[PDB]
Amino acid sequence: SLDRLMNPLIDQYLYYLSRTQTTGGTTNTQTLGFSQGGPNTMANQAKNWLPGPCYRQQRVSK
Amino acid sequence: VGNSSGNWHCDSTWMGDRVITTSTRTWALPTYNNHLYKQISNSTSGGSSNDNAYFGYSTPWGYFDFNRFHCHFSPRDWQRLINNNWGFRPKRLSFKLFNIQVKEVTQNEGTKTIANNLTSTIQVFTDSEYQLPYVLGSAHQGCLPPFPADVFMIPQYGYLTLNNGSQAVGRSSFYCLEYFPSQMLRTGNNFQFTYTFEDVPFHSSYAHSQSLDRLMNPLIDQYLYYLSRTQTTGGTTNTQTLGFSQGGPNTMANQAKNWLPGPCYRQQRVSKTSADNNNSEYSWTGATKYHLNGRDSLVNPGPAMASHKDDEEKFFPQSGVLIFGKQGSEKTNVDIEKVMITDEEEIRTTNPVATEQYGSVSTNLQRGNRQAATADVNTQGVLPGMVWQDRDVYLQGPIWAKIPHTDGHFHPSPLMGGFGLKHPPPQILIKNTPVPADPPTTFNQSKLNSFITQYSTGQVSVEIEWELQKENSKRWNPEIQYTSNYYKSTSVDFAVNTEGVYSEPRPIGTRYLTRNL
Amino acid sequence: TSADNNNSEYSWTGATKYHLNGRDSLVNPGPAMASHKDDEEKFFPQSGVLIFGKQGSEKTN
């Protein structure tokens, strides 16, 4: 599938946004935590292509 | 045994409109799972996410990873390329591999002697039919050393299939390369092969001298008209009327153009300045994404876009562009200073800005009793009349990608940027040959599990012959160029600190030379 | 027909447009379209088509 075309044993050598606020105790402040894409965070890994075109339709049951 | 398997051919040369290049590098080879296969899903896990579910197999094999540029071009040279040509396209590709050796390892009482076993071997092959799941186009680390003198290990290999959570479907497939012919190889014996690309549109490495709204003449006016008045304006009275006018040098904004900006995908904006961002964790929730088969996945880097508009250097798209990390970076929650972001101000010329609306439209038809309706557009498809430029490439970036062998593909230009092909270069895979240990004295039905752990190594290179369209611009004014600033710096650029670690100062673009639109 | 239009100046505000590099510009004549449906000869797109001027026309309003 379009989201599983990469290798599971490695990580992208790029980074992506993973933190908007601090997480170390009982305090909230503006911060920025960046990280690479791992085998455990595949969902966020940067892909290279895009799904196809679409037209929403109402659903129905058998 | 007493003869080199070839010479170290690694240079950069320019004979004119073509450029040849090769880089020799030394690698290593480790066995895996003791020559055994595997199954992988939420196992050596994370816990529960139809979005983080997977299904694949770790094979005892390894492969090559050189889909980047800093692996074929030293910086300077790349520069040379940039300031002189407008576009290029790689045509030829050679591959050499030699000087193999085999090492074994006996770990007795912590005392381990490492000698060679010149009689062992390995086997490699290629897939010229692309029957094996393609692994590249994912920019997985472990590319050839951006540097030439260092050495590296070859990343193991594993693929995946159509899955359903922690279970697979019937149609799920399962392959085993041990089913493919492979030039066997013993020490001293060499191996090489060759392939040649096919036709491809030269990735245009340049910017534009005008924007889609300023392509007309300032001294004249369109001989057409446009709506300029809905009501009267002559005193203290309001009545329905219609004032039409031509397009002048003072009303350029309204002048009828002939073409249309490119496609778009709205994204949330963010700042490099920590305090200017809202105080809420929206990294995963307020993020732009698509829905597929229940698994919701992010849309990165998404379509071609513009990082920001003028003077918005503080912001960039939430997940609209690439990011890099200076050498020494680790896996997670690192800060912004250990990384580098990509500036895309070069496309404001023709493509929209990610954190910006595409434009507005109406939702109704007014009358004397109905108010003028006006909505917004953050999602946009394409129509006849659009033009854009794909994402620019970066030296520390990917080079090409495998076009999915399907019935429908459109302007297959990859998103990370680069080049696509219906028949991409091939994947080469190697593994240490298995060699069993002392077997029993009598028979035993079961197969073997005891082998001499060993590893092998050697050096390789690759030749690339490209094409390039040299510039013909007669712009009089001196364009911009790429250069290391002339002030004094403690640690040189692309140098190696007093420790030998080699790091890059900033990422590098190619859209430097400005060519007319 | 002048009287059938709402009484508000939306020439620039209620107009269809795109945003690029901060400069918001109109979208004229825009993509290929249909002027109107049957018997709607009274209407046309705000900035969806071309317009011409008989000889002797001046610059504005």
Add this chain to the structure above:
Amino acid sequence: VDIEKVMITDEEEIRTTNPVATEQYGSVSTNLQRGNRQAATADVNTQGVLPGMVWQDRDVYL
């Protein structure tokens, strides 16, 4: 006529690359946040094409 006198077409074969009709295409944002502005997020049920898409046309039936 009822549902039993008919037969429907199963298209599970494309979840591989194309979206699902009764599903959103995905989400996007509508605004730019600040310390005083909340993160805007809308939905997309209508979608055109862009460079970077790939799909497979409807399969045929005997």
Add this chain to the structure above:
Amino acid sequence: RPKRLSFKLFNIQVKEVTQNEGTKTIANNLTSTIQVFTDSEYQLPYVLGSAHQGCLPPFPADVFMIPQYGYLTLNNGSQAVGRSSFYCLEYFPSQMLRTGNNFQFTYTFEDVPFHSSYAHSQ
């Protein structure tokens, strides 16, 4: 679909003008000249496709003046950027031309989809 395109230009003349005390005599200076050229490499900002008035007279018997010329670049309000460019055609070869001497040239289109000038029956 238009395939071929020729271009001819001739019968040039030169006039000078002395405005003395409001009394201005206009005679010719047959020894002056001009120079023109073409851009077969499209290195100059294209100006057409903007439907700017001053096209050849829709009519044939009238006469007209040639609109001046001006282009633009990547800008930032009332200021320009570094990458902004600046050209000067005085940098291009140009068949010089004196009165009595003619000048012409020729070009030919390339493949294009015939614009369908018809409606549909369904």
Add this chain to the structure above:
Amino acid sequence: QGPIWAKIPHTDGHFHPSPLMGGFGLKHPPPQILIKNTPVPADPPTTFNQSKLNSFITQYS
């Protein structure tokens, strides 16, 4: 009374480049021809002057 063709932007991506005003597009459109009256200076000084000239016989062709 309309336009005939237009210059396709020399880019990497263009789709059904059919212009919007309508007409024909080309990767290599007909050319642009430009002309100007040649400059001819007026009576220059009797001695030298570093600066260039600004006085010419106004004329037209």
Add this chain to the structure above:
Amino acid sequence: VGNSSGNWHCDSTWMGDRVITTSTRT
């Protein structure tokens, strides 16, 4: 000693009414 004694020829191929096959194993 410094030369492989051959390549790993292990595949399945169908040329029509015939079928060739081989399997390498250690």
